[PDB]
Amino acid sequence: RPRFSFSIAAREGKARTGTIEMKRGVIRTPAFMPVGTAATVKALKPETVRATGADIILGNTYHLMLRPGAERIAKLGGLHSFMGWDRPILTDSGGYQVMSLTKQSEEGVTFKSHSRHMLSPERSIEIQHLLGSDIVMAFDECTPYPATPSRAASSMERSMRWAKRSRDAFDSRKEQAENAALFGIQQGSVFENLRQQSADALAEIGFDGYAVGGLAVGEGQDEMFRVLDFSVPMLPDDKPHYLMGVGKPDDIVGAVERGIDMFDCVLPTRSGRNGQAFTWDGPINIRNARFSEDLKPLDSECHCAVCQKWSRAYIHHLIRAGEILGAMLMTEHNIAFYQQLMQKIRDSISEGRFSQFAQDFRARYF
Amino acid sequence: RPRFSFSIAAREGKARTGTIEMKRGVIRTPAFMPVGTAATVKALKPETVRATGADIILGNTYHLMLRPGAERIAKLGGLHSFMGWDRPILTDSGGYQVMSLTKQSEEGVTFKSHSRHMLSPERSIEIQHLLGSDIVMAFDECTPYPATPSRAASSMERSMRWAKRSRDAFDSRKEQAENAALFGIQQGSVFENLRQQSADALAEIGFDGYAVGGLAVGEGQDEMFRVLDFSVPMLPDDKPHYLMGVGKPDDIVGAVERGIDMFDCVLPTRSGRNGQAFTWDGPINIRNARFSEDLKPLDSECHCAVCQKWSRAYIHHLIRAGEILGAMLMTEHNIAFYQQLMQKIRDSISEGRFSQFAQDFRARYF
Ligand SMILES: Nc1nc2ccccc2c(=O)[nH]1
Ligand SMILES: Nc1nc2ccccc2c(=O)[nH]1
Ligand SMILES: [Zn+2]
Ligand SMILES: [Zn+2]
């Protein structure tokens, strides 16, 4: 088990399928990472998360640095033993969440805990180290949407300076540099020239993987794909491409077609508790009266435990009754559905029939 | 597998240990029945409930007749397939919940859904049949606490008339009378003569088991035990004795010492989500700051999955963060703890050392 090794086993167009080997395990790509906000993938035990097929989960730094605190989790042995997940864990830098859920300067960002806090590239990298993150994300400044070329450039340029600092901060910490990986984050809003600048600077600094940031800011899928079309090719081909905050089945398939290898999004979990269930025939709102006496499983083909044991009628009842089990069952199904999606994606690419799979997927889902 | 067969395998004082054989399974007594309010044991999958050691669960008729409706559940195949629990299920008559969570008459009770509804002995028995209940409880009128001798007598006498009606309603339904069992409920508040009257009337009508009702109404454990001391002996010795709504470790041990064979209470589940965890050293509130960095499991001896994988510090974090997993883990532990309690009880009685076990239990728990 090497610190980090990305191998591409097959391609079709811009799409790629392969593996990322790390000390804590192998990550099959394209990969979908279930999101674990506060040291938990909402409503699911780690074993359940793994059982659905996930090889890696995403840990939210923002919430953890606040509660229960990075230093504390390190004192308890790290995020891995703390939450009972022994496989790889990717941690975001926290800057994003801060700018969403404040005084900003070239040194970093200061904010009030919804207490006062300072978060810089150095502190971000240290927090992720304290948590014991396997894939560390560089600390960046997200660019609001819409953004003017000038503003986008300033932010992108600041992010690149911050990327260099993240890099050095990471390399300066022996244990971290030797057991974990560092991903740089491309910015530049929807402007091609900025994206190119960011890509080259990122490549110039050198990272283990490259993320495409600033694309989950309210733009439509059409604009996102347009941006991906010219952005992903700018990134080093032999390293993973990670589309941050992007999920939603059809979004994922389109991004893979454009070269993305990694995904994360709260939709599976959040929508689940909200009553939305993903199926190959598109999403459905289980709370709708039409499911009150529907004995069929959430999805007719899904092989997840939920679809094997319970009906839509029962889950319909639980969600409308505000029952915790409803949240558990919906979330397990959705995450299982997402992993199943990724598996079909990896298989179709390995078999040189991903294009057909994508077409067939869209035809039925919509 | 007979319809109903209670066998006592061992005794020590008033305590008894044995089994109740029913079509859907064997129930080891003394037994604790996890409570499933709205067709679910809050925060737990049926397999998990079973894994903790439960042989039977209690289904709340009240909530089910309202949502999703008895007729509907019968249409979907019954409570068993609806919730994924194929073992025995005991259903309360619903009258209690109505008088708690309204126009009362000799024919029954009318109430407003917190819609208008009528619930009589006949309707109660039919609802439980529609749900597919294995152990049907007679429809009774609970006696408020405190209650005067006159009022207690009127209510007890009405309950006895209602017990006869429940009996006939049950026997008049072929499929139900042949596959399920019927338990009568003793009333009479804290008055010995009324309890005796109720017991004889109940015995006169004849039931498969006898419950001691009206004892979870705010009286202290001292008064409850006093009542149990003279009440339980009045009930037929060769049939199960069920103390309704009574849980809380020390309450259970004391009631077994006084001849009770069956228990149910929401404390395990409700307290769990509230942050209270039961241990052999007494209950603890996991939210307390003293557990923020406690790496030990909820309880040092518990063999439940939660205590094998997660620390008090993690569960402390989840509960304070309002995380669903916290509710899941706390509830699994508590129910597992309750089942472990019952096992130690059954074993000590089988081994003629229940008295010592009770003494040792109290010494440490308190
Ligand atoms: N740090 C960071 N995190 C993100 C998460 C989702 C979408 C976008 C981003 C982004 O641009 N930067
Ligand atoms: N039907 C019924 N249910 C109960 C539940 C808990 C305690 C007491 C009672 C009782 O007396 N009757
Ligand atoms: Zn499913
Ligand atoms: Zn435990």
Burial class (CB within 10 angstroms; exposed 0-12, middle 13-18, buried 19+) of A302:
buried
Interface contact flag, B293 A72, Cβ < 8 Å: yes
This structure was determined by X-ray
Q: Does B296 touch chain A if contact means CB atoms closer than 8 Å?
A: no
The dihedrals phi and psi of A31, each to the nearest 5 degrees, come to -120, 145
Residue to mutate (ligand 1; options A58, A63, A90, A92; most atoms within 8 A of CB) = A92
- How far apart, in Å, do the first and last CA atoms of chain A sit? 42
Q: What is the 3-state secondary structure (H, E, C) of B179-220?
A: HCEEEEEECCCCCHHHHHHHHHHHHHHCCCEEEECCCCCCCC
**Contacts of residue A34 in chain B, CB cutoff 8 Å?**
none
Residue A98 makes CB contacts below 8 A (sequence gap 6+) with A62, A109, A111, A119
- Which ligand has its closest atom nearest to the C-alpha of A139? 1
A52: closest CA of chain B, how far (Å): 16
Q: A321 and chain B: CB distance < 8 Å anywhere?
A: yes
Closest CA–CA distance from residue B215 to any residue of chain A (Å): 28
What dihedral angle (degrees, nearest 10) is formed by the CA atoms of A247, A250, A253, A255?
-60
Report the nearest atom of ligand 2 relative to the CA of B92: 1
How is residue A319 written in tokens?
């969600």
Kindly report the backbone phi and psi dihedral angles of residue B17, in degrees, each rounded to the nearest multiple of 5, phi listed first: -135, 140
Long-range contacts of B44-50 (CB under 8 A, 24+ apart): B44/A325, B44/B328, B44/B331, B44/B332, B44/B335, B45/A325, B45/A328, B45/A329, B45/B84, B46/B83, B46/B84, B46/B85, B47/B84, B48/B332, B49/B85, B49/B335, B50/B85, B50/B87
Q: Is the C-alpha dihedral spanning B217, B222, B223, B225 positive or negative?
A: positive
The experimental resolution of this structure, in angstroms, equals 2.0
| Cβ of A247 less than 6 Å from ligand 1 | no
Closest ligand, as measured to the CA of B155? 2
- The ligand that comes nearest to the alpha carbon of residue B307 is 4
Q: Which residue's C-alpha comes closest to atom 2 of ligand 2?
A: B96
Segments forming the whole domain that contains residue B248: 1-366
Q: Is A185 in the pocket of ligand 1 (CB under 6 A)?
A: yes
* Torsion A154-A157-A162-A163 (CA) sign: positive
Q: Which CATH number fits the domain that encloses residue B63?
A: 3.20.20.105
Instruction: Find residue A19's DSSP bridge partners.
Output: A7, A28
User: How many independent structural domains does chain B possess?
Assistant: 1
Give the other-Cβ count within 10 Å of B260's Cβ. 28
B295 CB within 8 Å of a chain A CB = yes
Active site residues of A: 92, 264
Closest approach atom of ligand 1 to CA A245: 6
To test the pocket of ligand 2, the residue of B140, B156, B266 to mutate (highest count of ligand atoms within 8 Å of its CB) is B140
CA separation (Å) from B33 to B73, B267, B335? Answer: 21, 12, 9
> How close does chain A come to B324, measured CA to CA in Å?
5
